[PDB]
Design a protein around this ligand. Structure first.
Ligand code: MG
Ligand code: MG
Lengths: 233, 244, 198, 204, 222, 250, 241, 212, 242
């Protein structure tokens, strides 16, 4: 069984499964937790950063792609770099060649197409990281969830990483509330923090521990880390 | 995938040996015996042919002794086709050296180059080696008479008398027995023949089963002559020696 | 052009080559050695385009040195030359041909005879009693055609070169600043430190 | 600049009664400056002869190239190449560089060892093959040579006589050309033997 | 044959003060004898307190300016939001320029800003990269007219101290933004009087620790 | 995508055998019998036309192929493998010979060329040896008449006569008695016909036998007149009728 | 096209093909190099699969990379040929561009890197060779001895050996070589090298070949006889007891 | 342009002028024509501004890399041949540069190499390079002597540039002096021709083809 | 067999884990980062007394402001260092300034996962992960003194102190205790020296342990045997009390 059909991404199991892709998805579940949630005016990202020792830094999980887009990563960081870098290039191309801010919807479509090549090609390997993408554009705020399988989905909010299910359910209830947090950045953030706290167990989210990012109407994708997230615990 | 069907022809055993090389050598040991004996005024190359019949035309045949250039020749033990590939390229490297330097190519250089082509198949590319071993008989202004040998591992060495193919240990032992530093061409021929005679996996050593070659620097001339013996002449040299 | 003369005596080859490098309106150096030792018994003299000159020389040097080591042997002069010719003949049809002219003077230790080869940037090679490249030959060949004898001594050849130099200093328009002479014989290669006044 | 006129030189060959002859001059210069008095232009691969006029570096290159090709030919075919065949090899080797030719004008002379018939031929720098029963001329003095041959020549001359003919043809044609001369050599070719004679001529 | 190049006139001038620097440029854009635009800016804010202008063949100037802003964008990305100091921007441009050494950006560029110490700085480039830091520099068509003026009025060349038998140079003081702007305006009106490519408008970009301020003055439109 | 099979598919076994090659020789063994006998003034190669159904049209399949106007080849083993070898062999006779020397290549050289291809299929990455053995017969001004056999390993050897495939051994044995060095072509044809008969299981006539010869020059087959050096092709495929006339003299 | 990863990691952190290459090294004849106070000696034992050789021609074990640097090895003979040539070229190239011959270290670092490279490039197996490279840096008199292995690792030694039974001879060196007084002479260094070789070569004059490298391009291979003299005098510094 | 460097008892002197021209247009008079590679290596520039600045700043990099790689400081010979071989690769493309690589190393001692875009690399004791080279040589050659004092050397190199700055339209601005010793290069100032000429005339009593 | 870029059922890259194992067998390397500099010390680990200890390069300079210590199959690090050096020099060329240590480090880690056999993602030309890990320490003006641990997985973390190699878990644990914001360069030298002593099989002395530091004032300095020996001595006394 499995041991015969999991050797590579160019093999389908007898059930119609792609194990290498599936195995890829697992490194995500192993990663720390991050949450995304958008109102109609802003989109926030709150992600729990994970240290290695009490003597180390907390792996940076959010990346700015353009002044209007960014994402939080969950899983294999390198693959995150490779992917955000690609997102950076496509954003650049739209600005340069069309003087148009790239549509998050399109950014999504592009990421899916990139991952998919490493899920039907020999010797290649699926990406091992999930991504939460937020952005404000010509049609308001957005939040996109990307999976190495190549699947990308736009949601009012969501969470990924270990214990993600906590926050994912939390938001699923908190919806009617946060989606109405228009014109009040700090609140959405709060909502985000609360949500993120729903997938905790270790210790309470701290200064070196938390990472939040916000994008919106008159707010360029800005990264808040440590000293500045204090007011959000 | 494709890796599935890859034999990895250039890998090491846990013992630090090269499978494909070791296995090629084995192939070669089932091949007709070839011998090279170096004299003080010549070199003899003799070979025993494998695959014979009443109908095989021996006249217009040359399956074991090949001319590389006017001063060097080789005797082959292995796959005859793999042989021709290496020969055609060795012949060429000879001519290149010539054009470039206007001097005939030193036997060892030619040899070393050929050995280098073989070592390649040993270290990269993923292809099976050539199942061939060579005994080169050549002359040159820097070392005169030379006899070398090369095999699938791309290693080469020089010899006073040597053999390759089937029954090497037997022949080698016989050669170590009757060979002496100050031999002469007409004598080495005899030795060459005798040796073949006692290692042959057949009944009697007949002319049609042999290929003989000599590289003599005749005194009344100056140019190193290469003579690849013709059937009638093998028969003759054979009677002289008494094998009949 | 710069001066490159070579004359093969009975037991040696003497190459004479000008000490000046001029660029535009100024003589930049008055002590250039337009020569490279290809091997202990083979010296090559060169002249032509500004950079191609040394670049081609040193390249040929490297290649001959390498062969020397790979085989622990010294290629015959004739060999070194045929090699040089082919490098040239291949260059002439490249994108940017080496515009270099060379004289190769070597002592063939096997034949125990000095040799001198003249090769132009097109890979035109010829073996000669004496040769030159540039405009110098226009004077020296006739001078030598008259004063040269096959059985001359190293000393006689040097004096013959002296005549050549003098004729050149008399009639050529450019001040080439004298020459550096080098003799290639059985015991190697040595530079006549005494030619500016012999 | 005209590649074919830098070095100077001539070659000519004629056929006789069971013989052929090919000769040439020994000059090699650089425009006005004579540089070498010993530059032969006739070469041979076994019993086949090739004379090459034109740019010296190319003459040299082509010689080396046909030694190679003929050497390998013998190793593969186990016999020496014939004229009729070498000609084709020359032609094709030349056409191979159709748009960046070797500036040369080869001449082939020999006697078929199988048929014994005399054979000679010339080519333009890109391979046109001119097989003639009479003579073939080439070099800087080609016009002059054509003049000599066309008049002096007559069918079926004996070796001894042909030698005269070819010699006078060369000699005289060379003297009316500034770029040729400085020595001459003639090859008389017969099945059995071939004799090479040097000629005494104006050294100007 | 197709001629890949053109000349769009214009003239630019940059002056570095003690705690500021300006980069002014005219606003006209022409072609041969026709005016393409009376208002087409060529001095831009590139972020990080750096203003730049690449005057000459507008297509090239534009391409250059584009590639640099972008270089600033990626400097932030690749080097964790670090601010590109002017000296670094300069060297970066040298490379942008010299990359096209065999099909040059037919432009004379200048950037202004504050150095690492906060003092004013101006840097100017040859179309293939030669660059240097300077007190002031003009570029473009009327460069030859304006430059001498600045050597005199900004660097006080040839001006000596009265009654010293010409043995003591005028004290090399540093102008205020107000004076600098006066000079910029004069240099430009003058240039407009005599050059047919200069005119229509003047846009100056002033650079201080407080950011980048824009000033605009009208010029003759004939 | 892309042929990533860049490694040899024929390697060495611990007994020193090249599996794929031996196997190809087996495939050959399963193939119909074909033979070639060499005369003093000719050579004949023949084989049987294993009509794989009576609905199929025998003539529309040449198992005997002309390589040059003086060379032919017949085989035993996998036909397709053969057909493509003829194509190549016919091409190489031009590219490596007629386009350089202005004359067709000599038997041994052409053979030498064919052989080299087969060898490559024994070592090149990603392929399997050819499942054929061929008998190539020709003539050339300098070597006279010849007959060669080329195996999947790429080895070739000249023969006075031989047979390959199914009834090889029996046939090889039958030839050894009849053959001698004073055979005039007609007699060898005859012998070939006899030899062939014994391998042939059922029908035996010109519609089931493909026999070709390499003999005298045939100007009526040149197609043009006026040039006295090109005397005509020496290879001739025998007609059904011509075979029967010799069959009716069993 | 052929790009299969042959040297790869196995569950325990080993690169088998690299390790298996070390074995082929162990299977090769011994080679020793010990450095004196003004020299470096490199000795090697001789193979014995068959005998009736032509001592004159057969490529010895010690090779000159340049007029002042030598390299001996233990391993696949053929494999060593490639490293030598590659080393020689770089020896020339370096001369051409730096106008100075290589230091033994440079040459070492070069050869070393080539080995490492083959342990992580597709389509190739590591070099089944280990080398001893010795000589003197241009214009310096301090002897240099370095060793390289198929992994690509390298470093220097006062004395060292590689090849079959190197474990045994290493011990002899470890005991007989004092870093406070390296064999202060060409003679005693040669001796110590022979003594060491003897412990395993097992009394065989024609079984040993020694080479000495002195400063400024002075490299000399001893005669079958001069060594035999060392073997003789050495069997006495064991017999007189 | 106008640059010189010459060898002597106390080391090497490198003096260059500082004018940049666009044809007859004086583009600048404040250009540094000497690039300080490492504490013991100076490279002078003449020809295309960019070509020199660019490839010499680059040279500086390749020199540093060598340090990192070999732990030893790059020789002047090697440093120079890098530029030279580089330039030779671009031969025929239009690079325009004439430069001198001066420096001191324990191995070579004081050393100066001239390398130009034609690929000529030469070692020597005195080189003047640039449109004003002849002017510099004139003055330099006539007063140069090996046993010169460091102070006199400085002055001489200085003076020679002065010379060229005066006569050669294409040279001027100010002279930049450098002294290369056993312990490295020592900068000896930037001297404005605007004032240097007058001082020199009065003190030395030369340039009498001028009144003032 | 299976490819070199295959994911285990636990979501990890085999070859990466495996190389990480090979790294566990290396000589210890410890780096501690203080407000006065960063110390990087390593254990030479001579495999024989005839090997000239000083010929062991496990601490290298990337640039005057960046140094680095390796641990693992040290031959694999050569191409990494080279890239590190070129990356820093090149940066100085294109921007006339020093490369940020993070940046340098990040550039090195970009090589990490570039292994494969035709992995449709770019052109990955390396057959297997690096079998070594690095401790990269340096200083820039923006973020002060920094120490980074770079693994063959492409990830790298910043540590106030870190140990890699054989004695990692033990040493790491010790570091964890001993470390504090207000440490001093000498204290750090000591800890490295002390902790090295502990995890080292043979007895730590000047010929088998190597110390180095990088400071704003003097840059990357590899401590000379004599200086380190003095510290070793200063340690026997600090330890030979209480
Ligand atoms: Mg005349
Ligand atoms: Mg108007």
């Amino acid at each position: 069984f499995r041991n015969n059909y999991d050797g590579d991404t160019v093999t389908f199991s007898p059930t119609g499964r792609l194990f290498q892709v599936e195995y890829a998805l697992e490194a995500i579940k192993q990663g720390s937790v991050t949450v995304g949630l958008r109102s109609n005016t802003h989109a926030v990202l709150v992600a729990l950063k994970r240290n290695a020792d009490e003597l180390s830094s907390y792996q940076k999980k959010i990346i700015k792609c353009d002044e209007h887009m960014g994402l939080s990563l969950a899983g294999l960081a390198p693959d995150a770099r490779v992917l955000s870098n690609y997102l950076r290039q496509q954003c650049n191309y739209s600005s340069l060649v069309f003087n148009r801010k790239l549509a998050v919807e399109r950014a999504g479509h592009l990421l899916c197409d990139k991952a998919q090549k490493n899920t039907q090609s020999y010797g290649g390997r699926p990406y091992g990281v999930g991504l939460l993408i937020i952005g404000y554009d010509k049609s308001g705020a957005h939040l996109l969830e990307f999976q190495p399988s190549g699947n990308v989905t736009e949601l009012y909010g969501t969470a990924i990483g270990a214990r993600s299910q906590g926050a994912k359910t939390y938001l699923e209830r908190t919806l009617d509330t946060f989606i109405k947090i228009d014109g009040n950045p700090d609140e959405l953030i709060k909502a985000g923090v609360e949500a993120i706290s729903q997938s905790l167990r270790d210790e309470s989210l701290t200064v070196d521990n938390l990472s939040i990012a916000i994008v919106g109407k008159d707010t360029p994708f800005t990264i808040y880390d440590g000293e500045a997230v204090a007011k959000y615990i | 995938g494709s890796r599935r069907y890859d034999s990895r022809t250039t890998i090491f055993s846990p013992e630090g040996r090269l499978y494909q090389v070791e296995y090629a050598l084995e192939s070669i040991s089932h091949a007709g015996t070839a011998i090279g004996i170096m004299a003080s005024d010549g070199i003899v190359l003799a070979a025993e042919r494998k695959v014979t019949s009443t109908l095989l035309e021996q006249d217009t045949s040359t399956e074991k002794l090949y001319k590389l250039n006017d001063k060097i020749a080789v005797a082959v033990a292995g796959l005859t086709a793999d042989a021709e590939i290496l020969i055609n390229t060795a012949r060429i490297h000879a001519q290149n050296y010539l054009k470039t330097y206007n001097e005939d190519i030193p036997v060892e250089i030619l040899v070393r180059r050929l050995s280098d082509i073989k070592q390649g198949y040993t270290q990269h590319g993923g292809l099976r080696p050539f199942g061939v071993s060579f005994i080169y008989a050549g002359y040159d202004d820097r070392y005169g008479y030379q006899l070398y040998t090369s095999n699938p591992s791309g290693n080469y060495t020089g010899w006073k008398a040597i053999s390759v193919g089937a029954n090497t240990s037997a022949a080698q032992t016989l050669l170590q027995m009757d060979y002496k530093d100050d031999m002469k061409v007409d004598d080495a021929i005899e030795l060459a023949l005798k040796t073949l005679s006692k290692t042959t996996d057949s009944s009697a050593l007949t002319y049609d089963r042999l290929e003989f070659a000599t590289i003599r620097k005749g005194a009344n001339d100056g140019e190193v002559y290469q003579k690849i013996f013709k059937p009638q002449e093998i028969k003759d040299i054979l009677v002289k020696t008494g094998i009949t | 052009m710069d001066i490159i003369l070579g004359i093969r005596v009975q037991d040696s080859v003497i190459l004479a080559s000008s000490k000046a490098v001029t660029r535009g309106i100024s003589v930049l150096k008055d002590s250039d050695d337009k020569t490279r030792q290809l091997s202990p018994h083979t010296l090559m003299s060169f002249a032509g385009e500004a950079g191609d000159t040394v670049q081609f020389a040193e390249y040929i040097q490297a290649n001959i040195q390498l062969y020397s080591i790979r085989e622990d042997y010294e290629l015959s002069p004739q060999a070194v030359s045929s090699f040089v010719r082919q490098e040239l003949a291949k260059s002439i049809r490249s994108r940017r041909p080496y515009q270099v002219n060379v004289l190769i003077g070597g002592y063939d230790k096997k034949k125990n005879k000095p040799e001198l080869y003249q090769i132009d940037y097109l890979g035109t090679k010829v073996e000669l009693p004496y040769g030159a490249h540039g405009y110098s030959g226009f004077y020296t060949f006739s001078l030598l055609d008259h004063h040269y004898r096959p059985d001359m001594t190293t000393e006689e050849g040097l004096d013959l070169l002296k005549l050549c130099v003098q004729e050149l200093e008399k009639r050529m328009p450019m001040d080439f600043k004298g020459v550096i002479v080098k003799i290639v014989d059985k015991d190697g290669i040595r530079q006549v430190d005494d030619f500016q006044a012999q | 600049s005209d590649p074919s006129s830098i070095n100077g030189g001539i070659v000519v060959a004629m056929t006789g009664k069971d013989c052929v002859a090919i000769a040439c001059d020994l000059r090699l210069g650089s425009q006005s400056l004579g540089v070498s008095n010993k530059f032969e232009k006739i070469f041979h691969y076994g019993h086949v002869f090739l004379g090459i006029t034109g740019l010296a570096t190319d003459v040299t290159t082509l010689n080396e190239m046909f030694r190679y090709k003929t050497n390998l030919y013998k190793l593969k075919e186990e016999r020496a190449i014939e004229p009729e065949t070498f000609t084709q090899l020359v032609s094709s080797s030349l056409y191979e560089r159709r748009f960046g030719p070797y500036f040369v004008g080869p001449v082939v002379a020999g006697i078929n060892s199988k048929s014994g018939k005399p054979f000679i031929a010339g080519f333009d720098l890109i391979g046109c093959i001119d097989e003639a029963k009479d003579f073939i001329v080439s070099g800087t003095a080609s016009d002059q040579l054509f003049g000599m041959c066309e008049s002096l020549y007559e069918p079926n001359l004996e070796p001894e006589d042909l030698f005269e003919t070819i010699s006078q043809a060369l000699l005289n044609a060379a003297d009316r050309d500034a770029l040729s001369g400085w020595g001459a050599v003639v090859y008389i070719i017969k099945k059995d033997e071939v004799v090479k004679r040097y000629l005494k001529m104006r050294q100007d | 044959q197709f001629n890949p190049y053109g000349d769009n006139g214009g003239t630019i001038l940059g002056i570095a003060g003690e705690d500021f620097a300006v980069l002014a440029g005219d606003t006209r854009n022409i072609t041969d004898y026709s005016i393409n635009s009376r208002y087409e800016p060529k001095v831009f804010d590139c972020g990080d307190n750096i203003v730049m202008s690449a005057n000459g063949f507008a297509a090239d100037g534009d391409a250059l300016v584009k590639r640099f802003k972008n270089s600033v964008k990626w400097y932030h990305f690749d080097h964790n939001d670090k601010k590109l100091s002017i000296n670094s921007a300069a060297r970066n441009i040298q490379h942008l320029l010299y990359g096209k050494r065999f099909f040059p950006y037919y432009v004379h560029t200048i950037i202004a800003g504050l150095d690492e110490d906060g003092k004013g700085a101006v840097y100017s480039f040859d179309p293939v990269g030669s660059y240097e830091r300077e007190q002031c520099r003009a570029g473009g068509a009327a460069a030859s007219l304006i430059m001498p003026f600045l050597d005199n009025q900004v660097n006080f060349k040839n001006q000596y101290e009265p009654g010293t038998n010409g043995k003591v140079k005028k004290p090399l003081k540093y102008l205020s933004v107000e004076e600098v702007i006066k000079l910029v305006r004069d240099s430009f009106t003058s240039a407009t009087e005599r050059h047919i490519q200069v005119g229509d408008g003047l846009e100056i970009l002033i650079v201080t620790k407080d950011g980048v301020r824009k000033e605009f003055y009208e010029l003759k439109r004939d | 995508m892309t042929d990533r099979y860049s490694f040899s598919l024929t390697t060495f076994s611990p007994s020193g055998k090249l599996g794929q090659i031996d196997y190809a020789l087996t495939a050959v063994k399963q193939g119909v019998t074909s033979l070639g006998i060499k005369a003093t003034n000719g050579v004949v190669i023949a084989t049987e036309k294993k009509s794989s159904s009576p609905l199929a049209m025998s003539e529309t399949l040449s198992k005997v192929s002309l390589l040059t106007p003086d060379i032919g080849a017949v085989y035993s083993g996998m036909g397709p493998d053969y057909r493509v070898l003829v194509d190549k062999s016919r091409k190489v006779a031009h590219t490596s010979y007629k386009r350089i020397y202005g004359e067709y290549p000599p038997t041994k050289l052409l053979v030498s060329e064919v052989a080299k291809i087969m060898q490559e299929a024994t070592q090149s990455g990603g392929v399997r040896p050819f499942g054929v053995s061929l008998l190539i017969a020709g003539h050339d001004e300098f070597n006279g008449f010849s007959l060669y056999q080329v195996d999947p390993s790429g080895s070739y050897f000249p023969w006075k006569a031989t047979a390959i495939g199914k009834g090889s051994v029996a046939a090889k044995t039958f030839l050894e008695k009849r053959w001698n060095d004073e055979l005039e072509l007609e007699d060898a044809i005859h012998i070939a016909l006899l030899t062939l008969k014994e391998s042939v299981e059922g029908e035996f006539n010109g519609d089931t036998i493909e026999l070709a010869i390499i003999g005298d020059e045939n100007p009526d087959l040149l197609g043009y007149t006026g040039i006295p050096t090109d005397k005509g092709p020496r290879f001739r495929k025998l007609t059904s009728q011509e075979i029967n006339d010799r069959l009716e003299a069993l | 096209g052929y790009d299969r990863a042959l040297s790869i990691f196995s569950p325990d952190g080993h690169i088998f093909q690299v390790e298996y290459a070390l074995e082929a090294v162990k299977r090769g004849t011994c080679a020793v190099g010990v450095k004196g106070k003004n020299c470096v000696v490199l000795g090697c034992e001789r193979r014995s699969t068959l005998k009736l050789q032509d001592t004159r021609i057969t490529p010895s074990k010690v090779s000159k990379i340049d007029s002042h640097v030598v390299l001996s090895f233990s391993g696949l003979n053929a494999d060593s040929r490639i490293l030598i040539e590659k080393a020689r070229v770089e020896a020339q190239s370096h001369r051409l561009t730096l106008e100075d011959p290589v230091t033994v270290e440079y040459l070492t670092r070069y050869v070393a890197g080539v080995q490492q490279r083959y342990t992580q490039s597709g389509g190739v197996r590591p070099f089944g060779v280990s080398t001893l490279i010795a000589g003197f840096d241009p214009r310096d008199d301090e002897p240099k001895l370095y060793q390289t292995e198929p992994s690509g690792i390298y470093s220097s030694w006062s004395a060292q050996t590689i090849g079959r039974n190197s474990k045994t001879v290493r011990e002899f060196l470890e005991k007989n070589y004092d870093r406070k007084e390296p064999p202060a002479t060409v003679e005693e260094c040669v001796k110590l090298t022979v003594r060491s070789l003897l412990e395993v070569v097992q009394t065989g004059a024609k079984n040993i070949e020694i080479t000495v490298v002195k400063p400024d391009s002075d490299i000399v291979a001893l005669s079958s006889e001069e060594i035999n003299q060392y073997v003789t005098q050495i069997e006495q510094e064991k017999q007189e007891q | 342009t106008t640059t010189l460097a010459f060898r002597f008892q106390g080391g090497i002197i490198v003096a260059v002028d500082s004018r940049a021209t666009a044809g007859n247009w004086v583009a600048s008079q404040t250009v540094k024509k000497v690039i300080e590679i490492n504490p013991f290596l100076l490279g002078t520039m003449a020809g295309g501004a960019a070509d020199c600045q660019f490839w010499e700043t680059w040279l500086g990099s390749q020199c540093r890399l060598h340090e990192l790689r070999e732990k030893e400081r790059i020789s002047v010979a090697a440093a120079s041949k890098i530029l030279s071989n580089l330039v030779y690769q671009y031969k025929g493309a239009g690079l325009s540069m004439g430069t001198m690589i001066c420096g001191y190393t324990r191995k070579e001692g004081p050393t100066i190499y001239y390398v130009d875009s034609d690929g000529t690399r030469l070692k020597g004791d005195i080189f003047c390079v640039g449109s004003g080279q002849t002017f510099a040589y004139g003055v330099l050659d006539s007063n140069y002597k090996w046993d010169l004092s460091v102070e006199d050397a400085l002055y001489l190199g200085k003076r020679s540039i002065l010379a060229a700055a005066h006569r050669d339209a294409y040279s001027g601005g100010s002279v930049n002096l450098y002294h290369v010793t056993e312990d490295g290069w020592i900068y000896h100032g930037n001297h404005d021709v605007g004032e240097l000429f007058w001082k020199v005339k009065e003190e030395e009593g030369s340039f009498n083809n001028v009144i003032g | 067999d299976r490819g070199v870029s295959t994911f285990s059922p636990e979501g990890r890259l085999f070859q990466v884990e495996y190389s990480l194992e090979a790294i566990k067998l290396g000589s210890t390397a410890i780096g501690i980062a203080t407000k006065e500099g960063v110390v990087l010390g390593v254990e030479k680990r001579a495999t024989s007394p005839l090997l000239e200890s000083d010929s062991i390069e496990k601490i290298v300079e990337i640039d005057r402001h960046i140094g680095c210590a390796m641990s693992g199959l040290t031959a694999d690090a050569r191409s990494m260092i080279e890239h590190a050096r070129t990356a820093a020099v090149t940066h100085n060329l294109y921007y006339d300034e020093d490369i940020n240590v993070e940046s340098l480090t990040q550039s090195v880690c970009d090589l990490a996962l570039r292994f494969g056999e035709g992995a449709s993602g770019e052109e990955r030309l390396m057959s297997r992960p690096f079998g070594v890990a690095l401790l990269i320490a340096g200083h820039d003006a923006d973020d002060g003194y920094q120490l980074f641990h770079a693994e063959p997985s492409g990830t790298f973390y910043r540590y106030n102190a870190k140990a890699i190699g054989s004695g990692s878990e033990g040493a790491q644990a010790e570091l964890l205790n001993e470390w504090h914001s207000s440490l001093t360069l000498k204290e750090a030298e000591l800890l490295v020296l002390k902790i090295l002593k502990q995890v080292m099989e043979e007895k730590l002395d000047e010929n088998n342990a190597q110390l180095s530091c990088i400071t704003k004032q003097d840059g990357f300095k590899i401590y000379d045997n004599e200086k380190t020996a003095e510290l070793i001595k200063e340690l026997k006394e600090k330890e030979a009390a209480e």
